[PDB]
Amino acid sequence: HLPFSKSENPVLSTIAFLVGLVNPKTVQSMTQRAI
Amino acid sequence: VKILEQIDENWSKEDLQKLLKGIQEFGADWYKVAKNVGNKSPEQCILRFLQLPIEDKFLYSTIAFLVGLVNPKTVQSMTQRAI
Amino acid sequence: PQAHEIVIPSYSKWFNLEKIHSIEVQSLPEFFTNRIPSKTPEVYMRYRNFMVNSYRLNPNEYFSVTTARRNVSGDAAALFRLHKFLTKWGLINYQVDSKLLPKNIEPPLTSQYSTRHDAPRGLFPFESYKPSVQLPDM
Amino acid sequence: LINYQVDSKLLPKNIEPPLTSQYSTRHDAPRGLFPFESYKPSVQLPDMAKLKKMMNTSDSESTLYKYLKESKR
Amino acid sequence: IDTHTATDIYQTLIALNLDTTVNDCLDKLLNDECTESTRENALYDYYAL
Known about the structure:
The structure is cut from a larger assembly and holds 4 copies of chain A and 1 copy of chain E (49 residues). With 35 residues, chain A is mainly alpha-helical. Chain A has 1 helix and no strands. Chain A has one helix at 16-27. Chain E is built from 2 helices and no strands. In chain E, α1 (4-30) runs antiparallel to α2 (39-48). The longest helix of chain E has 27 residues, at 4-30. The N and C termini of chain E lie far apart (34 Å). The chains are: A mainly alpha (35), E mainly alpha (49). The A-B interface holds A 1-6, 15-16, 19, 22-23 and B 59-64, 76, 78-79, 81-83. The PDB classes it as transcription/dna. The entry lists the keywords SWI/SNF, chromatin remodeler, transcription, TRANSCRIPTION-DNA complex. SWI/SNF nucleosome complex with ADP-BeFx. Chains A, B, C, D are SWI/SNF complex subunit SWI3. Chain E is Transcription regulatory protein SNF2.
C-alpha cells in the first residue's frame, strides 16, 4: 500500500479504486456536496 | 542502507567499541564484558546494549499496528489498509 | 579479603552498604527529624555498615545485639531497635543455619530451551509463498 | 596547624567492607516466571537471492517477463 | 484481500534487505583498498548485526 510499501502481489488487477468506487456508488448522493 | 552505530553519548566511541568487541567473541558473559570495558557496571552495559537501534528496518497501518492477528479478508476490509 | 558465599532474601535487594533508602527511614525515623543532635544519618550508617560487616564475616554462626552493645554504643535502645530491624530484614543473622537437599529431577530443567510455542515478543514461523519473490525488492 | 606530615593513627574494627553477594527468594515469579522454551541465537540466510537473481533459468522471473511480453497484446 | 500477503512480504523483506546490508558492509570492509577509517565502521556494523 502507500502507508505500507508492502503491497499485495499483483501483475494486472485493480484493488484500491475498486472499493473506492463501491463506497462511492453506495453514497447515492447524486448531489453529493464534496470536493 | 549505511547503518551507523557510532551514535551514542556519555559513552565514548571506543566504549561501545570494546563493548561489542567483547560480546562478539565472549558470548554474553556480562562479568567478562564488564571487565572487558572501561569501568561501566555490567548492568549498565546490558542496558545500553539493550537500547541499540537497528534504525533501517522498521518501516512506518493495518499491519504496521497489528501482528500475529488481523482483520479477516473476504469483505471490504481494505478500507482499513487505506486508513 | 573475602572468604564466604553470602546470599540474601532478594526482596531486600534495595539495600546498599553505601547509601540509604526511604524504606528504613519510614521504619526508623528517629535519626532524621534532626532534633537530637547526638543522632544523625551518619552515625546511623556507621552502626549499620559495622554490624552488617560483622555478620557477613562469619555468618554461619549467629550474632547478637548484645555483642555490638559491648563493642560500640551511643544507646542501648536505638541499637536494639535497628539491630532487630535488620534482623527482620534478614540483612543480619540470616544464614545462621544451613539446609540441604538431594533434589531429584523432573521433565523441566534449567538447561532445557527448545523450539515451541512462545508467549514472548514476536516471531514468524511461516515465511513466504512463491509469488512473494515477484517483487522489485530493495 | 598540627599533624601535617603523617598518614596513620586510625581506629580498628578488625574488618573491611566486603563486596560479594548472592540472592535467592524463590516462590515462582522471580528467577523468571518460567516461560516456555525458545531458541534462535543467530540469524540465518534466505538463500532466495539466487532464486531471486536474474538468470535465464529464473523460476518465474524470466518466465513472467515472457508472460507479460506475450500476453500484453 | 491483503492481510497475510502484505504482512508476510513485509516480514520477509525486512530480513532480505538486512542480509543485503550484511553482504554490503562485509565486502566493503573486505576490500582493503578502502580506508582504515571506513573499515572499522563496517566491522563494528557486522558485529552489531
